[PDB]
Amino acid sequence: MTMDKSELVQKAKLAEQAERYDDMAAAMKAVTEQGHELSNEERNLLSVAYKNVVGARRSSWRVISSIEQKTERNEKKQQMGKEYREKIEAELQDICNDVLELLDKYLILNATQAESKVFYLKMKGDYFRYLSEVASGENKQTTVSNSQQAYQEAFEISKKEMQPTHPIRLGLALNFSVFYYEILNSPEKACSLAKTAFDEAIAELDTLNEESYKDSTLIMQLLRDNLTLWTSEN
Amino acid sequence: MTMDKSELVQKAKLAEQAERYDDMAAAMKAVTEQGHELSNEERNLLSVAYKNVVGARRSSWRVISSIEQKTERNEKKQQMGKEYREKIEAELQDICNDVLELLDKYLILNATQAESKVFYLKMKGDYFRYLSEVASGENKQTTVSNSQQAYQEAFEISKKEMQPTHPIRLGLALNFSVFYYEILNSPEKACSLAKTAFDEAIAELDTLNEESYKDSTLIMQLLRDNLTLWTSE
């Protein structure tokens, strides 16, 4: 948008406080479309806004999907359940596609440092993952594959360029391992990935911190908890 | 759109389960616009949908208003708080105005029994009251006056036609008394209305019935609590 960036950012913050996450996302999409690299604060606002927008549609889709499954002899209740589920699905797809287009058009190509690049490639993986959850047929294999590919690309960059305790690297490992567990139904790959990322970070508990170690240890703990759970479920 | 009434109702119910109240409201608006008197189930769906739609905006408006009064020294910051509040205010106005138009064009004129008519006039009062909360200047006096007028018209019918324990009649007295107290700053009139409604209901306990016993006595208790609070001030 042609609106002042600082005004759009302030509107995003107000929208967040008002719990008007569709407004928050529109403000940050407008900031993105100015075509400058986002600051850390701006990137976080964009990410929170769309998480919450897509989150609301995912929750509605789960509720309506349950109703629609559940055998329905009543012709109008059944047909309206299915049509409404389809309407929510399309809304969700449109949101994810809008994010994916921001990523491909502005965010990934304007990213000039490895950490930002990893952050955005991770987000691409996350939004393909959301699309996967509602996809069917060939489109499902395609979205799953695209999600894996974005997460893998992020991950190789993060291993080459970032410290293993960096919270963005750790957050990627968390999400990627959970992708394997929940989307690909592969607890073995999920464990293998989470274990390596956890062990690599452990090898560098030489952060500083003692004052700020928790920026890393809190996600490390999430990885370690998944590992213990997964190992004690197989 | 091509949906028939049964489809729209089913959609409204699905929308409610999904917490998609804007969709719920749009479905009940379309049902209304078909021009038939609403069933009791339908009238309740419409009321719940719009309560939730408007309630969300009002909640946002209160949040923004509070932030705007903490500060903030900016050319933007106080200015953006005000502009964003104003955006919320126009959204709220558009919702209330849509309801008011449904009420003026379909609901009130198609109502064939007193209880419906009172319900919808009360709602007209309620939605002019919501508009008042964000109005300023001359438009504020106009919305307040319109709220009072609709509540009054409802009240005159209810006293003539409905039992004093009827939950709609009691709910009207509650909302109307609270209007006088909170919006018009007239505690004496507020107390008088609440006290009369409470006293009339209590004199006719045998008109209570199993189906609406709880609904009635809960409102009667609200009226009695306001009365105790107000008289204490």
Short mmCIF file of all heavy atoms in Angstrom, two decimals, chain A residues 4 6-8 10-11 13-20 23-24 56-57 59-60 63-64 67 76-77 79-81 83-84 87-88 91, chain B residues 1 3-4 6-8 10-11 14-15 17-20 23-24 57 59-60 63-64 67 70 75-77 79-81 83-84 87-88 91, unseen atoms left out:
data_model
loop_
_atom_site.label_atom_id
_atom_site.label_comp_id
_atom_site.label_asym_id
_atom_site.label_seq_id
_atom_site.Cartn_x
_atom_site.Cartn_y
_atom_site.Cartn_z
N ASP A 4 1.64 5.24 4.69
CA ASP A 4 2.92 5.28 5.46
C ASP A 4 3.17 3.96 6.23
O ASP A 4 2.31 3.48 6.97
CB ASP A 4 2.85 6.41 6.46
CG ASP A 4 4.13 6.59 7.27
OD1 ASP A 4 5.17 6.96 6.69
OD2 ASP A 4 4.09 6.37 8.52
N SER A 6 4.95 3.31 8.88
CA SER A 6 4.85 3.38 10.34
C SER A 6 3.39 3.40 10.80
O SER A 6 3.06 2.84 11.83
CB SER A 6 5.62 4.60 10.94
OG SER A 6 5.00 5.82 10.51
N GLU A 7 2.53 4.04 10.04
CA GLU A 7 1.09 4.04 10.31
C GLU A 7 0.48 2.63 10.15
O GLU A 7 -0.32 2.24 10.95
CB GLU A 7 0.41 5.04 9.39
CG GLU A 7 0.78 6.48 9.85
CD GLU A 7 0.05 7.63 9.22
OE1 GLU A 7 -0.76 7.44 8.28
OE2 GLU A 7 0.26 8.76 9.76
N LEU A 8 0.84 1.92 9.08
CA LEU A 8 0.40 0.52 8.88
C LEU A 8 0.87 -0.40 10.00
O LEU A 8 0.09 -1.15 10.56
CB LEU A 8 0.86 0.01 7.57
CG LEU A 8 0.25 0.59 6.31
CD1 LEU A 8 1.14 0.17 5.13
CD2 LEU A 8 -1.15 0.10 6.06
N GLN A 10 1.55 0.59 13.08
CA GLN A 10 0.80 0.92 14.26
C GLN A 10 -0.64 0.35 14.21
O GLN A 10 -1.19 -0.10 15.21
CB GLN A 10 0.77 2.42 14.49
CG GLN A 10 0.23 2.84 15.86
CD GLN A 10 0.65 2.00 17.09
OE1 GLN A 10 -0.21 1.42 17.81
NE2 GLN A 10 1.98 1.97 17.37
N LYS A 11 -1.26 0.41 13.04
CA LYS A 11 -2.55 -0.24 12.84
C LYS A 11 -2.55 -1.74 13.05
O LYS A 11 -3.51 -2.28 13.60
CB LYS A 11 -3.14 0.05 11.46
CG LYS A 11 -3.83 1.39 11.49
CD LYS A 11 -3.97 1.95 10.08
CE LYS A 11 -5.08 2.96 10.01
NZ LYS A 11 -5.30 3.72 11.27
N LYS A 13 -0.61 -3.30 15.11
CA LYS A 13 -0.53 -3.48 16.56
C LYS A 13 -1.83 -3.23 17.29
O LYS A 13 -2.22 -3.96 18.22
CB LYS A 13 0.59 -2.59 17.13
CG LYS A 13 1.97 -3.07 16.72
CD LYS A 13 3.04 -2.11 17.25
CE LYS A 13 4.42 -2.68 17.02
NZ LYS A 13 5.43 -1.60 17.25
N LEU A 14 -2.55 -2.23 16.85
CA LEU A 14 -3.86 -1.96 17.40
C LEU A 14 -4.87 -3.10 17.09
O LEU A 14 -5.62 -3.54 17.95
CB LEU A 14 -4.40 -0.66 16.83
CG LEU A 14 -3.61 0.57 17.34
CD1 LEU A 14 -3.92 1.73 16.42
CD2 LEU A 14 -3.98 0.87 18.77
N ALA A 15 -4.85 -3.55 15.84
CA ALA A 15 -5.70 -4.67 15.39
C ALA A 15 -5.45 -5.94 16.26
O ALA A 15 -6.40 -6.64 16.69
CB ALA A 15 -5.43 -4.92 13.92
N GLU A 16 -4.16 -6.23 16.52
CA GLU A 16 -3.80 -7.33 17.38
C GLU A 16 -4.48 -7.17 18.75
O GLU A 16 -5.18 -8.06 19.21
CB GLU A 16 -2.27 -7.43 17.52
CG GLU A 16 -1.86 -8.65 18.27
CD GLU A 16 -0.37 -8.76 18.49
OE1 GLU A 16 0.33 -7.75 18.36
OE2 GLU A 16 0.04 -9.88 18.79
N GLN A 17 -4.32 -6.01 19.36
CA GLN A 17 -4.96 -5.75 20.69
C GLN A 17 -6.49 -5.89 20.64
O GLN A 17 -7.12 -6.38 21.59
CB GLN A 17 -4.56 -4.36 21.17
CG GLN A 17 -3.07 -4.36 21.56
CD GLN A 17 -2.45 -3.00 21.87
OE1 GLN A 17 -2.25 -2.17 20.95
NE2 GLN A 17 -2.14 -2.76 23.13
N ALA A 18 -7.09 -5.43 19.55
CA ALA A 18 -8.52 -5.54 19.37
C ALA A 18 -8.98 -6.99 18.98
O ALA A 18 -10.16 -7.23 18.74
CB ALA A 18 -8.99 -4.54 18.33
N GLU A 19 -8.04 -7.89 18.81
CA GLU A 19 -8.30 -9.24 18.28
C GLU A 19 -9.00 -9.19 16.94
O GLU A 19 -9.89 -9.99 16.67
CB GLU A 19 -9.07 -10.12 19.29
CG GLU A 19 -8.28 -10.29 20.56
CD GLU A 19 -9.09 -10.94 21.67
OE1 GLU A 19 -9.22 -12.15 21.61
OE2 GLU A 19 -9.58 -10.22 22.57
N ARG A 20 -8.53 -8.32 16.06
CA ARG A 20 -9.09 -8.16 14.70
C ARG A 20 -7.97 -8.63 13.75
O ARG A 20 -7.27 -7.84 13.16
CB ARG A 20 -9.50 -6.72 14.50
CG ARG A 20 -10.79 -6.38 15.21
CD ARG A 20 -11.19 -4.91 15.14
NE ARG A 20 -11.30 -4.45 13.77
CZ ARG A 20 -12.40 -4.40 13.05
NH1 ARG A 20 -13.57 -4.75 13.56
NH2 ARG A 20 -12.35 -3.95 11.83
N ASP A 23 -7.76 -7.70 10.03
CA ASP A 23 -7.17 -6.36 9.86
C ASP A 23 -5.66 -6.36 10.02
O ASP A 23 -4.96 -5.71 9.26
CB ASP A 23 -7.73 -5.37 10.86
CG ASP A 23 -9.15 -4.85 10.44
OD1 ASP A 23 -9.65 -5.21 9.35
OD2 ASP A 23 -9.73 -4.06 11.19
N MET A 24 -5.19 -7.08 11.05
CA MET A 24 -3.74 -7.18 11.31
C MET A 24 -3.00 -7.70 10.10
O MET A 24 -1.96 -7.14 9.71
CB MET A 24 -3.47 -8.05 12.52
CG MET A 24 -2.05 -8.01 13.04
SD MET A 24 -1.85 -9.22 14.35
CE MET A 24 -0.14 -8.89 14.78
N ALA A 56 -8.09 -19.60 12.79
CA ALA A 56 -9.55 -19.52 12.95
C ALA A 56 -10.26 -20.39 11.87
O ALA A 56 -11.23 -21.06 12.16
CB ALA A 56 -10.02 -18.11 12.87
N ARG A 57 -9.83 -20.31 10.62
CA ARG A 57 -10.44 -21.09 9.54
C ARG A 57 -10.19 -22.61 9.71
O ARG A 57 -11.12 -23.42 9.39
CB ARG A 57 -9.94 -20.66 8.16
CG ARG A 57 -10.75 -19.54 7.56
CD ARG A 57 -10.55 -18.28 8.35
NE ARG A 57 -11.10 -17.10 7.74
CZ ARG A 57 -10.82 -15.87 8.19
NH1 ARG A 57 -10.03 -15.68 9.24
NH2 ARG A 57 -11.36 -14.82 7.62
N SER A 59 -9.80 -24.22 12.61
CA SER A 59 -10.68 -24.65 13.67
C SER A 59 -12.12 -24.80 13.19
O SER A 59 -12.79 -25.79 13.48
CB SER A 59 -10.61 -23.68 14.82
OG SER A 59 -11.62 -24.03 15.71
N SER A 60 -12.61 -23.83 12.39
CA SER A 60 -13.97 -23.93 11.84
C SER A 60 -14.06 -25.15 10.90
O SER A 60 -15.09 -25.83 10.87
CB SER A 60 -14.34 -22.64 11.05
OG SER A 60 -14.39 -21.48 11.86
N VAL A 63 -14.41 -28.34 12.90
CA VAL A 63 -15.75 -28.47 13.47
C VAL A 63 -16.75 -28.93 12.39
O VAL A 63 -17.55 -29.89 12.56
CB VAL A 63 -16.26 -27.15 14.07
CG1 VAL A 63 -17.70 -27.27 14.49
CG2 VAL A 63 -15.39 -26.74 15.28
N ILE A 64 -16.74 -28.23 11.27
CA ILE A 64 -17.70 -28.53 10.20
C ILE A 64 -17.40 -29.86 9.52
O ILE A 64 -18.33 -30.60 9.20
CB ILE A 64 -17.82 -27.41 9.17
CG1 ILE A 64 -18.27 -26.11 9.84
CG2 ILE A 64 -18.83 -27.79 8.10
CD1 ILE A 64 -19.56 -26.19 10.64
N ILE A 67 -18.99 -32.68 11.59
CA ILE A 67 -20.45 -32.70 11.31
C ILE A 67 -20.77 -33.36 9.98
O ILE A 67 -21.66 -34.22 9.90
CB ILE A 67 -21.06 -31.29 11.40
CG1 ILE A 67 -20.97 -30.79 12.85
CG2 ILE A 67 -22.51 -31.29 10.99
CD1 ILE A 67 -21.25 -29.31 13.04
N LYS A 76 -31.04 -32.15 3.34
CA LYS A 76 -30.64 -30.74 3.38
C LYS A 76 -29.57 -30.49 4.43
O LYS A 76 -28.62 -29.76 4.17
CB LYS A 76 -31.82 -29.83 3.69
CG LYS A 76 -32.89 -29.62 2.61
CD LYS A 76 -32.47 -29.22 1.19
CE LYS A 76 -33.36 -28.06 0.67
NZ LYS A 76 -34.60 -28.49 -0.02
N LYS A 77 -29.68 -31.12 5.60
CA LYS A 77 -28.60 -31.02 6.58
C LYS A 77 -27.30 -31.54 5.97
O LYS A 77 -26.30 -30.89 6.13
CB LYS A 77 -28.93 -31.83 7.85
CG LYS A 77 -30.14 -31.32 8.61
CD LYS A 77 -30.50 -32.13 9.86
CE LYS A 77 -31.17 -31.19 10.87
NZ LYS A 77 -32.26 -31.79 11.69
N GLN A 79 -26.35 -31.93 2.67
CA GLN A 79 -25.84 -31.15 1.55
C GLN A 79 -25.31 -29.79 2.04
O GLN A 79 -24.31 -29.33 1.50
CB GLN A 79 -26.86 -30.94 0.45
CG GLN A 79 -27.16 -32.21 -0.32
CD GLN A 79 -28.37 -32.11 -1.19
OE1 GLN A 79 -29.26 -31.30 -0.93
NE2 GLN A 79 -28.44 -32.97 -2.23
N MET A 80 -25.96 -29.17 3.04
CA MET A 80 -25.50 -27.83 3.50
C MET A 80 -24.21 -27.98 4.31
O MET A 80 -23.31 -27.12 4.22
CB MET A 80 -26.57 -27.11 4.30
CG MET A 80 -27.75 -26.66 3.48
SD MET A 80 -27.29 -25.65 2.05
CE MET A 80 -27.11 -26.82 0.70
N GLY A 81 -24.08 -29.09 5.04
CA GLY A 81 -22.80 -29.43 5.79
C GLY A 81 -21.63 -29.52 4.83
O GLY A 81 -20.51 -28.99 5.06
N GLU A 83 -21.52 -28.33 1.60
CA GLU A 83 -21.29 -27.05 0.97
C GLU A 83 -20.60 -26.06 1.88
O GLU A 83 -19.77 -25.31 1.42
CB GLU A 83 -22.64 -26.46 0.48
CG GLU A 83 -22.58 -25.26 -0.47
CD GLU A 83 -23.99 -24.97 -1.07
OE1 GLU A 83 -24.56 -25.90 -1.71
OE2 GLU A 83 -24.50 -23.83 -0.92
N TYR A 84 -20.96 -26.02 3.15
CA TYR A 84 -20.34 -25.10 4.07
C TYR A 84 -18.86 -25.47 4.33
O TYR A 84 -17.99 -24.60 4.41
CB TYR A 84 -21.16 -25.01 5.39
CG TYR A 84 -20.83 -23.75 6.22
CD1 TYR A 84 -20.92 -22.51 5.66
CD2 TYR A 84 -20.44 -23.83 7.54
CE1 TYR A 84 -20.67 -21.35 6.39
CE2 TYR A 84 -20.17 -22.70 8.31
CZ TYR A 84 -20.28 -21.44 7.70
OH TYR A 84 -20.00 -20.27 8.38
N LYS A 87 -16.96 -24.24 1.42
CA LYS A 87 -16.79 -22.80 1.51
C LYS A 87 -15.65 -22.43 2.46
O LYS A 87 -14.84 -21.63 2.09
CB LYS A 87 -18.08 -22.17 2.00
CG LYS A 87 -18.00 -20.66 2.18
CD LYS A 87 -19.32 -20.13 2.68
CE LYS A 87 -19.41 -18.63 2.41
NZ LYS A 87 -19.14 -17.93 3.67
N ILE A 88 -15.61 -23.00 3.67
CA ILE A 88 -14.52 -22.79 4.59
C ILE A 88 -13.19 -23.24 4.00
O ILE A 88 -12.19 -22.51 4.10
CB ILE A 88 -14.76 -23.42 5.96
CG1 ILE A 88 -16.02 -22.83 6.59
CG2 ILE A 88 -13.56 -23.22 6.85
CD1 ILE A 88 -16.53 -23.67 7.78
N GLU A 91 -11.86 -20.71 1.58
CA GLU A 91 -11.40 -19.53 2.30
C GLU A 91 -10.01 -19.75 2.85
O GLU A 91 -9.16 -18.90 2.78
CB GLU A 91 -12.32 -19.25 3.48
CG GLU A 91 -12.69 -17.84 3.60
CD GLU A 91 -13.63 -17.53 4.75
OE1 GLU A 91 -13.18 -17.38 5.93
OE2 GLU A 91 -14.81 -17.40 4.41
N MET B 1 -28.86 -15.08 -4.00
CA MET B 1 -28.48 -16.51 -4.06
C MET B 1 -29.73 -17.38 -4.13
O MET B 1 -30.87 -16.96 -3.86
CB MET B 1 -27.58 -16.98 -2.91
CG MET B 1 -26.12 -17.17 -3.30
SD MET B 1 -25.24 -18.15 -2.07
CE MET B 1 -25.53 -19.86 -2.66
N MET B 3 -30.29 -20.19 -2.46
CA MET B 3 -30.78 -20.97 -1.31
C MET B 3 -32.22 -20.69 -0.90
O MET B 3 -32.65 -19.56 -0.88
CB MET B 3 -29.87 -20.77 -0.10
CG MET B 3 -28.52 -21.48 -0.21
SD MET B 3 -27.60 -21.34 1.35
CE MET B 3 -26.80 -19.75 1.04
N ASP B 4 -32.94 -21.74 -0.53
CA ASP B 4 -34.27 -21.68 0.02
C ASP B 4 -34.12 -21.51 1.52
O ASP B 4 -32.98 -21.50 2.03
CB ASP B 4 -35.09 -22.90 -0.45
CG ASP B 4 -34.60 -24.23 0.13
OD1 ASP B 4 -34.21 -24.33 1.32
OD2 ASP B 4 -34.62 -25.23 -0.65
N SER B 6 -35.03 -23.35 4.13
CA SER B 6 -34.53 -24.43 4.99
C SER B 6 -32.99 -24.54 4.91
O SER B 6 -32.33 -24.77 5.93
CB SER B 6 -35.22 -25.74 4.65
OG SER B 6 -35.00 -26.01 3.29
N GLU B 7 -32.44 -24.30 3.72
CA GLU B 7 -31.01 -24.31 3.51
C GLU B 7 -30.35 -23.18 4.33
O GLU B 7 -29.32 -23.40 4.91
CB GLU B 7 -30.69 -24.16 2.02
CG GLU B 7 -31.01 -25.44 1.25
CD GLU B 7 -30.87 -25.29 -0.26
OE1 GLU B 7 -30.82 -24.15 -0.82
OE2 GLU B 7 -30.78 -26.34 -0.92
N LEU B 8 -30.91 -21.97 4.26
CA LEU B 8 -30.36 -20.84 5.01
C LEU B 8 -30.37 -21.09 6.49
O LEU B 8 -29.40 -20.76 7.18
CB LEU B 8 -31.12 -19.58 4.67
CG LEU B 8 -30.98 -19.02 3.25
CD1 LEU B 8 -32.09 -18.04 3.01
CD2 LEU B 8 -29.64 -18.36 3.01
N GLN B 10 -30.30 -24.01 7.99
CA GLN B 10 -29.27 -25.02 8.28
C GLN B 10 -27.87 -24.36 8.25
O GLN B 10 -26.99 -24.59 9.13
CB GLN B 10 -29.32 -26.11 7.22
CG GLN B 10 -29.42 -27.55 7.68
CD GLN B 10 -30.12 -27.77 8.99
OE1 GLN B 10 -29.51 -28.27 9.88
NE2 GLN B 10 -31.42 -27.44 9.08
N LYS B 11 -27.64 -23.52 7.27
CA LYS B 11 -26.39 -22.78 7.21
C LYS B 11 -26.16 -21.92 8.46
O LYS B 11 -25.05 -21.79 8.96
CB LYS B 11 -26.38 -21.95 5.96
CG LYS B 11 -25.11 -21.18 5.80
CD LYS B 11 -24.83 -20.71 4.37
CE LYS B 11 -23.73 -19.59 4.31
NZ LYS B 11 -22.85 -19.60 3.08
N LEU B 14 -25.01 -24.20 11.20
CA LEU B 14 -23.61 -24.64 10.97
C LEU B 14 -22.60 -23.50 11.29
O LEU B 14 -21.57 -23.69 12.02
CB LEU B 14 -23.45 -25.08 9.55
CG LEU B 14 -24.21 -26.39 9.23
CD1 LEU B 14 -24.35 -26.53 7.73
CD2 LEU B 14 -23.46 -27.56 9.83
N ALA B 15 -22.93 -22.31 10.83
CA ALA B 15 -22.14 -21.11 11.08
C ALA B 15 -21.98 -20.90 12.61
O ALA B 15 -20.87 -20.63 13.10
CB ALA B 15 -22.75 -19.89 10.41
N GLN B 17 -22.16 -23.18 14.99
CA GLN B 17 -21.21 -24.22 15.50
C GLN B 17 -19.77 -23.87 15.17
O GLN B 17 -18.86 -24.16 15.93
CB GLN B 17 -21.60 -25.58 14.89
CG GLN B 17 -22.88 -26.09 15.49
CD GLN B 17 -23.41 -27.33 14.81
OE1 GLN B 17 -23.77 -27.29 13.63
NE2 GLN B 17 -23.48 -28.44 15.54
N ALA B 18 -19.54 -23.31 13.98
CA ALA B 18 -18.22 -22.93 13.55
C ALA B 18 -17.73 -21.60 14.18
O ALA B 18 -16.62 -21.18 13.90
CB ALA B 18 -18.17 -22.83 12.05
N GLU B 19 -18.55 -20.96 14.98
CA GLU B 19 -18.29 -19.59 15.50
C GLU B 19 -17.98 -18.59 14.39
O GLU B 19 -17.09 -17.73 14.49
CB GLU B 19 -17.20 -19.61 16.58
CG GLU B 19 -17.61 -20.45 17.80
CD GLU B 19 -16.48 -20.62 18.82
OE1 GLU B 19 -16.13 -19.67 19.52
OE2 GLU B 19 -15.94 -21.74 18.94
N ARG B 20 -18.75 -18.68 13.32
CA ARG B 20 -18.64 -17.79 12.19
C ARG B 20 -19.89 -16.91 12.21
O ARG B 20 -20.83 -17.03 11.39
CB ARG B 20 -18.46 -18.60 10.89
CG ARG B 20 -17.03 -19.19 10.79
CD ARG B 20 -16.84 -20.10 9.61
NE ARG B 20 -17.14 -19.43 8.35
CZ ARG B 20 -16.25 -18.92 7.52
NH1 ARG B 20 -14.96 -18.88 7.85
NH2 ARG B 20 -16.64 -18.32 6.43
N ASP B 23 -21.23 -14.98 9.13
CA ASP B 23 -21.99 -15.85 8.23
C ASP B 23 -23.37 -16.14 8.80
O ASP B 23 -24.33 -16.15 8.06
CB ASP B 23 -21.31 -17.22 8.07
CG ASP B 23 -20.11 -17.23 7.17
OD1 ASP B 23 -19.81 -16.15 6.58
OD2 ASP B 23 -19.47 -18.36 7.05
N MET B 24 -23.47 -16.41 10.12
CA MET B 24 -24.74 -16.69 10.75
C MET B 24 -25.73 -15.57 10.52
O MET B 24 -26.88 -15.79 10.22
CB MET B 24 -24.55 -16.96 12.23
CG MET B 24 -25.75 -17.52 12.95
SD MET B 24 -25.45 -17.62 14.71
CE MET B 24 -26.98 -18.35 15.26
N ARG B 57 -17.59 -6.21 17.76
CA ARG B 57 -17.20 -4.84 17.42
C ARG B 57 -17.16 -3.94 18.68
O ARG B 57 -16.24 -3.07 18.83
CB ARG B 57 -18.13 -4.24 16.33
CG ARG B 57 -17.66 -4.56 14.89
CD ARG B 57 -17.75 -6.02 14.65
NE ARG B 57 -17.52 -6.43 13.26
CZ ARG B 57 -17.79 -7.66 12.83
NH1 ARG B 57 -18.34 -8.56 13.62
NH2 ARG B 57 -17.56 -7.99 11.58
N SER B 59 -16.65 -4.79 21.78
CA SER B 59 -15.50 -5.21 22.55
C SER B 59 -14.19 -4.62 21.97
O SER B 59 -13.40 -4.05 22.70
CB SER B 59 -15.42 -6.71 22.67
OG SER B 59 -14.19 -7.10 23.25
N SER B 60 -14.03 -4.66 20.66
CA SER B 60 -12.91 -4.06 20.02
C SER B 60 -12.92 -2.55 20.26
O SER B 60 -11.87 -1.98 20.50
CB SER B 60 -12.90 -4.37 18.50
OG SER B 60 -12.76 -5.75 18.35
N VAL B 63 -11.58 -1.76 23.72
CA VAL B 63 -10.15 -1.96 23.76
C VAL B 63 -9.39 -0.80 23.13
O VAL B 63 -8.39 -0.32 23.70
CB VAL B 63 -9.72 -3.26 23.04
CG1 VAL B 63 -8.22 -3.34 22.92
CG2 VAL B 63 -10.27 -4.47 23.79
N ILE B 64 -9.81 -0.40 21.93
CA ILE B 64 -9.13 0.67 21.23
C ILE B 64 -9.24 2.00 21.99
O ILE B 64 -8.24 2.68 22.18
CB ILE B 64 -9.56 0.72 19.74
CG1 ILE B 64 -9.15 -0.59 19.03
CG2 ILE B 64 -8.93 1.88 18.99
CD1 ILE B 64 -7.70 -1.02 19.20
N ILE B 67 -6.78 2.06 24.94
CA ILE B 67 -5.42 2.31 24.42
C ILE B 67 -5.17 3.77 24.03
O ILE B 67 -4.09 4.34 24.30
CB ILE B 67 -5.09 1.42 23.21
CG1 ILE B 67 -5.05 -0.03 23.65
CG2 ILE B 67 -3.74 1.79 22.63
CD1 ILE B 67 -5.02 -1.05 22.54
N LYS B 70 -4.34 5.86 27.00
CA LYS B 70 -2.92 5.73 27.34
C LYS B 70 -2.12 6.20 26.13
O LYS B 70 -2.60 6.23 24.99
CB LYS B 70 -2.51 4.33 27.85
CG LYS B 70 -3.45 3.21 27.46
CD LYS B 70 -3.07 1.78 27.92
CE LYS B 70 -2.20 1.09 26.90
NZ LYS B 70 -2.58 -0.34 26.90
N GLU B 75 2.60 12.21 16.33
CA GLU B 75 1.80 12.62 15.18
C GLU B 75 0.94 11.45 14.65
O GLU B 75 -0.19 11.66 14.19
CB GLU B 75 2.66 13.22 14.03
CG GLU B 75 3.58 14.43 14.38
CD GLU B 75 5.08 14.06 14.36
OE1 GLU B 75 5.48 13.28 13.48
OE2 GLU B 75 5.86 14.56 15.21
N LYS B 76 1.48 10.23 14.69
CA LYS B 76 0.71 9.07 14.28
C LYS B 76 -0.13 8.49 15.43
O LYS B 76 -1.32 8.27 15.27
CB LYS B 76 1.62 8.00 13.63
N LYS B 77 0.47 8.30 16.60
CA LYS B 77 0.07 7.24 17.55
C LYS B 77 -1.33 7.47 18.12
O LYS B 77 -2.22 6.63 17.94
CB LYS B 77 1.13 7.06 18.65
N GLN B 79 -3.25 9.66 16.77
CA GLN B 79 -3.94 9.80 15.50
C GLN B 79 -4.34 8.46 14.90
O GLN B 79 -5.44 8.37 14.28
CB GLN B 79 -3.09 10.60 14.46
N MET B 80 -3.50 7.43 15.07
CA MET B 80 -3.85 6.14 14.48
C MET B 80 -4.88 5.42 15.35
O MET B 80 -5.73 4.69 14.85
CB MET B 80 -2.65 5.24 14.20
CG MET B 80 -1.71 5.78 13.13
SD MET B 80 -2.58 6.34 11.63
CE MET B 80 -2.60 4.78 10.80
N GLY B 81 -4.79 5.62 16.65
CA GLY B 81 -5.77 5.08 17.60
C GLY B 81 -7.15 5.64 17.27
O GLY B 81 -8.15 4.91 17.14
N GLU B 83 -8.14 7.04 14.30
CA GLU B 83 -8.58 6.56 13.00
C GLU B 83 -9.06 5.09 13.04
O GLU B 83 -10.00 4.69 12.37
CB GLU B 83 -7.47 6.64 11.98
CG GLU B 83 -7.38 8.01 11.39
CD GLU B 83 -6.25 8.06 10.38
OE1 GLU B 83 -6.09 7.06 9.59
OE2 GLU B 83 -5.52 9.08 10.39
N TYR B 84 -8.36 4.25 13.78
CA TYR B 84 -8.76 2.84 13.86
C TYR B 84 -10.10 2.70 14.64
O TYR B 84 -10.99 1.89 14.28
CB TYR B 84 -7.62 2.00 14.48
CG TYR B 84 -7.81 0.54 14.21
CD1 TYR B 84 -7.90 0.06 12.92
CD2 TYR B 84 -7.99 -0.34 15.24
CE1 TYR B 84 -8.11 -1.29 12.68
CE2 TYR B 84 -8.23 -1.67 15.00
CZ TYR B 84 -8.30 -2.13 13.72
OH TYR B 84 -8.53 -3.46 13.56
N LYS B 87 -12.85 3.57 12.28
CA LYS B 87 -13.12 2.43 11.42
C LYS B 87 -14.08 1.40 12.11
O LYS B 87 -15.06 0.93 11.50
CB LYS B 87 -11.81 1.77 11.05
CG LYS B 87 -11.97 0.56 10.17
CD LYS B 87 -10.59 0.01 9.77
CE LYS B 87 -10.71 -0.89 8.54
NZ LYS B 87 -10.67 -2.28 9.01
N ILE B 88 -13.76 1.05 13.35
CA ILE B 88 -14.60 0.16 14.15
C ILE B 88 -16.01 0.78 14.28
O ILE B 88 -16.99 0.11 14.05
CB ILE B 88 -13.95 -0.22 15.48
CG1 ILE B 88 -12.61 -0.92 15.21
CG2 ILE B 88 -14.84 -1.12 16.31
CD1 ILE B 88 -11.74 -1.07 16.46
N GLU B 91 -18.10 0.37 11.16
CA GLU B 91 -18.46 -1.05 11.02
C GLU B 91 -19.66 -1.38 11.89
O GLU B 91 -20.67 -1.95 11.46
CB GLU B 91 -17.27 -1.90 11.43
CG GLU B 91 -16.91 -2.92 10.44
CD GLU B 91 -15.73 -3.80 10.81
OE1 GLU B 91 -15.92 -4.75 11.58
OE2 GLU B 91 -14.62 -3.58 10.29
#
